[PDB]
Curated annotation (Swiss-Prot), chains A, B:
Belongs to the nucleobase:cation symporter-2 (NCS2) (TC 2.A.40) family. Azg-like subfamily. It comes from the Eukaryota. Transports natural purines (adenine and guanine) as well as purine analogs. Confers sensitivity to 8-azaadenine and 8-azaguanine (8-azg). The gene is AZG2. This is Adenine/guanine permease AZG2. InterPro entries: Azg-like (IPR045018), NCS2 (IPR006043).
Amino acid sequence: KTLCKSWSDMKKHLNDTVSKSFIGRFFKLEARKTTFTTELRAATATFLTMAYIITVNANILADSGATCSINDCSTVASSSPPGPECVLGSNPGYEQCISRVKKDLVVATSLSAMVGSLAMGLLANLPFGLAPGMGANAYIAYNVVGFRGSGSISYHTAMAIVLLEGCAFLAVSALGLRGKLARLIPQTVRLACAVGIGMFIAFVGLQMNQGIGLVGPDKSTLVTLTACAETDPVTGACLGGKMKSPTFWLAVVGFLITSFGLMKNVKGSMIYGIVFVTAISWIRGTQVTIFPHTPLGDSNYNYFTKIVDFHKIQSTLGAISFTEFRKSEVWVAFATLFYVDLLGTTGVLYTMAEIGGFVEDGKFEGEYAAYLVDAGSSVVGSALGVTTTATFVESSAGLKEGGKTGLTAVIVGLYFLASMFFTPLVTNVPRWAVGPSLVMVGVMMMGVVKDIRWGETKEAVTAFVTILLMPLTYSIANGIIAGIGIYLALSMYDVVLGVAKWLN
Amino acid sequence: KTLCKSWSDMKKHLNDTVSKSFIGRFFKLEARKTTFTTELRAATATFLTMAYIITVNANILADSGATCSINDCSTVASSSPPGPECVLGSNPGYEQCISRVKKDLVVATSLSAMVGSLAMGLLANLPFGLAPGMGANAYIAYNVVGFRGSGSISYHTAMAIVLLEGCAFLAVSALGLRGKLARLIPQTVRLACAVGIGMFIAFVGLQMNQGIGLVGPDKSTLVTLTACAETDPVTGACLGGKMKSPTFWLAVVGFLITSFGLMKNVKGSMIYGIVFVTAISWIRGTQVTIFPHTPLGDSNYNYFTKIVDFHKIQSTLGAISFTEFRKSEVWVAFATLFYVDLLGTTGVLYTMAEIGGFVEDGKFEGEYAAYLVDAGSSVVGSALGVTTTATFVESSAGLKEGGKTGLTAVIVGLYFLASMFFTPLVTNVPRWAVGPSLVMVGVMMMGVVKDIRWGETKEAVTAFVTILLMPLTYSIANGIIAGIGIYLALSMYDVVLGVAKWLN
């Protein structure tokens, strides 16, 4: 009987004693009508919903071959291994390097999230955390650096682009040239870019090398549904048997558990889907294991036996090279990244300002600092080996419970501190586990499609071309350019001419 | 001065004299408050908007190789031409056959449209015409018969499937088992199937063999943006130079003219886009011609010189074979076609009944006959060599002007009669001309996407999987099955169990 009353006899005392110290006046706990206990609940509610991006980022950036290259490949019977042999796989020397890089990138993501969340919390009094944004990881990894050394731009130039974008976004928002520039883009293309990004992200979660493996090549049509069980030992090709891949069905079950948990309003759901299909795919012996019986697979098992390990960044440290900025596509990629980051932290940071009573006429209490902290987080994360950071939409779950001061973004950072020590259990997440997690992101980003003015013709074609050309051409830069070209030709050639004639 | 008054001195007299004859009482021109002059304007307004499907159907069914096969191929230096040599192209013998088949299919489409429109007009007193439906052409051609003899099901079995579906839809609506069966499908999958069909139709209008030629194969990613100028002489492959294909830019200009004409509210627009880029691509000599300097291309020019020709169906006549119905996929295709046709003529035929004052409490004046005529049109068109017919949505343009009696659907049929004699100018429409026309169909079918309940989780996942898996797996049958599977597992395993437990 006294157990129930013990919580209440101490919670009020602790809340009264904490608010009267330096911290209570610092975080302004006497105003905004918020007690200390609610801050701990809201921080947990935000972290559990945001905890899924500690593994998706690592598995989506480790595919590009961050530091590993052709020089540190293994030795074979030939004289020297050629270009398209090591990076294609089936080589112990390159896979051992990629394992270390994957181990290194998790700590880099955790540190970047720590810095972003803590810097926002201490300097802006706003209760939402930070992490490497979802949407710019795929563009940098699967489109600029390429899949394991493909494309043209190398990894060092790709990380220099992040520094350049962060520095260019610092002195474009401190001056005040953001609202004059953020509202210049018409609402149709801005709103329809997210749908195309969601399609592109979900489409890459279905290939065999990236995701669970539905789609595959075909000789007559471009794509086909393989889901093949017996696949090629080296590359990916269907030999015999469709819809009988055990990994595919395990991934479908994992998707079903996430979908059933998102309804019924369970806060953290995208993490329990990954945990289930990973704990299942940790048992050695079956056909869905992540631990084979190869010497390469034994190297990943005599590291999972220990569950806590303080790992040091030793491969993907500061790696910046400006010696390749004199060509063309580097600037196009920089401009595309700037365009993606401009529309991201504009319609998101304001939506979470009208949920919680922060908003006033305009210019709520965290306008100036929250933008500079968000922009400098990308700079501070670029040297660590991760892409640009952004304010996560999933931080709204903490606002709905009562968190209003800046203490939430400090406890989120402190939670992210304790998630770095568990690297052994984060490196060993299979790709078919994070496959289902790339589809729900697209599903939740598609929810804004029911605001485009489909009644008009120009606003419908401009949205449809942008939505369609992004996943079918396998490029994010090919959607924005097409949308802008369609929008300019339909209107600027008829409307602007009238304005020019009206000057006479 | 008398010229203006001449029209008015005769229009009222003609309207008074026509309504007092047998036709006036037959079509009930004294009720429904409609004069004869409005019927001629509404028929033209319907035909001009519907006139685009006399060429898209022919070019989308001629790609499957309707009658041509391996037996009537040409003779080469080898003993006998193998399977994958003739059907892949670069053979005069097969192309000469496919030219005759394309000439034959236009008359078959015109006759099917004539019969459907005239049968609805005379027997149902409803002012909307008929034509081979848009959406079932691609499924039958590009998915069942395959691209030039691909796939498993042959052409004769594909036309037997149409007869079987028509006969099964006759005695499912005459009994009364339509409303009990049409409302059983939940609204989410029914509404999201159209968006996926639009995506699949627009995606096939971008390949090189089907459409204008943006997308192409890639070794690492599945699809890429080629738009290559110098292409392989036999097959389709990019050799050098992107975004400099003259046909691609001609098609983009044609798309721009259609998009600019659909706004400003011009009734017929999808036909003036085709006419422009065809009249341009009829001049012999340039790089965008449809008349090369080959002996094959000269055979298509000493037939365009004559502009009127009464052609007779002599290849794609009644061609039905039931000797291949004992395998599996035939029934799956029949069921998919039935599912597509059930949702089509249910949400469309009622929408055009509340625009014009036809509708009452329920059961407007054309419920019973309009369904049987629409179902029997598929049967009567199957023997002619075209797929199932459907009531076109583009027939609403005639309702907005004043057409209310059945005379509109007779004049539309009479217009379709005069469009058969111009076969020479209909067979010589290039594929890059109809490429832009396959995209606007998807754009106009996407306009219903802003009604799915995106707020809920089940109704969002069920719609998103159906939308996504249709174009990315290049199949319409793989979207419905996935949507139904997602919808059943999310709800039937939790809701139906409660109902079963409530019986105790």
